[PDB]
């Protein structure tokens, strides 16, 4: 299971996978969540950008990295 309780997710995105950012919750535009981590309950009427990862964009999910978020998140995988 995708739980990573007590540490950062750090799941590496693959090309074609969904990535989630939130204007309000993210510290900057590079702060992102994977589909296993993103919880809609954290982001009601927030300005959520869901993109499809490309060859150009590449990186890791920031869930559990509190240095990347303005609000406490609640991992979807933890539910
Ligand atoms: Zn994740
Ligand atoms: Zn997570
Ligand atoms: Zn949000």
From Swiss-Prot:
Residues holding Zn(2+) 4: 47
Mapped zinc finger ranges (UBR-type): 7-79
Effect of residue 62 to N/E: Abolished ability to degrade proteins with type-1 N-degrons without affecting ability to degrade proteins with type-2 N-degrons
Annotated positions binding Zn(2+) 1: 4, 37, 63, 75
Domain of life: Eukaryota
Positions of Zn(2+) 2 binding: 9, 34, 37, 61
Binding sites annotated in the UniProt record for Zn(2+) 3: 22, 25, 43, 46
Function: Ubiquitin ligase protein which is a component of the N-end rule pathway. Recognizes and binds to proteins bearing specific N-terminal residues that are destabilizing according to the N-end rule, leading to their ubiquitination and subsequent degradation. Recognizes both type-1 and type-2 N-degrons, containing positively charged amino acids (Arg, Lys and His) and bulky and hydrophobic amino acids, respectively.
Family recorded in the similarity comment: Belongs to the E3 ubiquitin-protein ligase UBR1-like family.
Subunit text: Interacts with UBC2. Interacts with RPN2, RPT1 and RPT6 from the 26S proteasome.
Name of protein: E3 ubiquitin-protein ligase UBR1
Lineage summary: Eukaryota, Fungi, Dikarya, Ascomycota, Saccharomycotina
């Amino acid at each position: 299971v995708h739980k990573h309780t007590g540490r950062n997710c750090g799941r590496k995105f693959k090309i074609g996978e969904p990535l989630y950012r939130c204007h309000e919750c993210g510290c900057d535009d590079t702060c992102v969540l994977c589909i296993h981590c993103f919880n809609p309950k954290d982001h009601v009427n927030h300005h959520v950008c869901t993109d499809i990862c490309t060859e150009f964009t590449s990186g890791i999910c920031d869930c559990g990295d509190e240095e990347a978020w303005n609000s406490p998140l609640h991992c979807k995988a933890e539910e």
